[PDB]
């Protein structure tokens, strides 16, 4: 996607790819997300009235304390320089799925009424891999009581492509007699 956030996230993740520090910056941005999730952090870093000088100062202090990759601290200073800081949370969010599309780790969403055993998780995971053609699959755990009795697992680029049998069966056998 041509979202500028995705552009920056792709640049960062691809630098990580051509170095080999992939998981090392993955954890880095995974913690950066929770840094910026608390609102005053983002508000301070984003509102431009604050001087870029002390902005960089506090950012360097956070670099030292929390611990950041060389290239990743560099990238955050690059954002603070080029004034894309309104998009910091979005860049940290696009890093996740661009790194997943890098490693072929198709994160999937499975949804049922109650929990399934990890045997069922491995079943559906291997099924998603044999329909998708990925390098790996990591399954996300969800419950949806709006379903009656079934499972509706999601895959694809977004959660676009979907197969489902809990209430889809209900409404499709509705429509037959409601022809």
């Amino acid at each position: 996607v041509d979202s500028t956030a995705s552009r920056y996230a792709s640049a960062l993740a691809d630098v990580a790819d051509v170095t080999g520090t992939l998981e090392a910056t993955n954890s880095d941005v995974e913690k950066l997300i929770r840094i910026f999730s608390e609102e005053p952090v983002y508000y301070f870093f984003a509102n431009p009235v604050i001087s870029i000088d002390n902005k960089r100062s506090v950012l360097d202090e956070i670099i030292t304390t929390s611990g950041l990759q060389p290239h990743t601290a560099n990238f955050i200073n690059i954002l603070i320089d080029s004034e894309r800081i309104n998009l910091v949370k979005e860049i940290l969010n696009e890093f996740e799925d661009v790194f997943n599309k890098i490693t072929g780790t198709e994160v999937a969403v499975v949804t049922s009424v109650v929990k399934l055993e990890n045997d069922h998780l491995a079943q559906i995971a291997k099924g998603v891999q044999k329909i998708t053609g990925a390098k790996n699959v990591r399954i996300k755990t969800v419950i949806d009581p709006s379903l009656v009795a079934g499972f509706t697992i999601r895959y694809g680029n977004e959660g676009s492509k979907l197969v489902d049998m809990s209430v889809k069966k209900q409404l499709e056998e509705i429509a037959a007699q409601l022809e």
Binding site: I131, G156, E158, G159, S160, M165, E173
Partner: protein, 500 residues
Amino acid sequence: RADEISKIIRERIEGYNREVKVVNTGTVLQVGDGIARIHGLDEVMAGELVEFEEGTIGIALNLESNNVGVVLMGDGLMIQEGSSVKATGRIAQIPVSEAYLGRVINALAKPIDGRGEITASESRLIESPAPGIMSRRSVYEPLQTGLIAIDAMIPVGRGQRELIIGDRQTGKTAVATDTILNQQGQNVICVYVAIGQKASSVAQVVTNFQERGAMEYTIVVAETADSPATLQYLAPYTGAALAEYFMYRERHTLIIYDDLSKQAQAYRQMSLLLRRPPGREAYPGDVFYLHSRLLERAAKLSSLLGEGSMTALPIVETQAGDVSAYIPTNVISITDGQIFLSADLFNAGIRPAINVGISVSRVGSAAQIKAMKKVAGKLKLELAQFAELEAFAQFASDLDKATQNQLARGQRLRELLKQPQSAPLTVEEQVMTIYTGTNGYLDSLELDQVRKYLVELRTYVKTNKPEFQEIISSTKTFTEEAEALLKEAIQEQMERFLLQ
């Protein structure tokens, strides 16, 4: 009997539980004024129908990088943000069958007459390709309208897109309606498409059809001004699909878009709501391609397709007599000649107000029979020359007998072309009328008795001599025999008229 149909229903639903098929389904970001953006749907085709959770049909046009641009076919009220939208796996299909004959229907091929749903087996694409160069033949049949001007000077043949252009209240709908209801015993399929018109005006047209009996062979695909922009935009395409289904099956068809400028306005609205950039007069750049992709599905198919036919009579609207406007110039460039309807001629008593001087027909005399060709080959050229002369002969004060005789015969020709409302003229009456005029008999009696002598002459020939009818029908040629009969009739009835 009530339960056994539900028995077949339950043996259905036992074999009808669920079938695992991968459906593309994403969420909704923006919803406003008929246009709804979509998040995801990376596999939906261009133009593929969608299903919003409420049950609203849609079409995905803008497959943008992040989001999907989906137009709504309906209202946008009950749609909720964040709800799911599901791709259909179909592309603008329309159920079509012969049962539609007599039905007023929405743009979704669903009935609005209250006569219950239409049974249809096949389904044809709303947007369909055109027949190729080799997949058509030239136009040779005539399509009878019933007006002497249209069917003599600027002919319309089966499979010729003839634009009925004109101002407001000039008789465009009346011309198209008379072209339709004249077709009762000619075995054609009529299709009346109304885009952005009064519900009551549509109802008047339908009631007129029902009382004149022309409803048996006519579909009325009508949309009112409250209809969504996508429905107003897709109405003519669905009408053309219904027409094409018969055109391919060796039928003859006639479709009237009435009018096209409202469809172009609907496409302008939907394009400006998709945030596309606007061209001249805030129309999108490709309204030309919009109208051409619609109109060029009218043709006269070749012999190796059954010689089916579809004649399109689209109606447009010149605002304030201006043909230079963008949509009028596009449609007079697209179509195969046009028919101009001028408010001045409507005012000045000449009904129909067919301004011949800027009317054309690209098929020419190839859309008439041998009789009317022989009697009126040079008619439009000489009538244009006489319009010039009568316009010019007022600057000169005194004129000689030859010019005055040409002028008088031209005025009698102008009195000939007057045609009342809902009065059709068969080809026999048309040929004999053009003969009686163009020969020079009518110059003696005066302009007020022209019309009544024509009425009396036609009644006289129809009573006395049916072999004129027989010749013009079976032989289709204006033989010396029929000419002798007609001259006897003109002489006899002229003497009788002098007496009366």
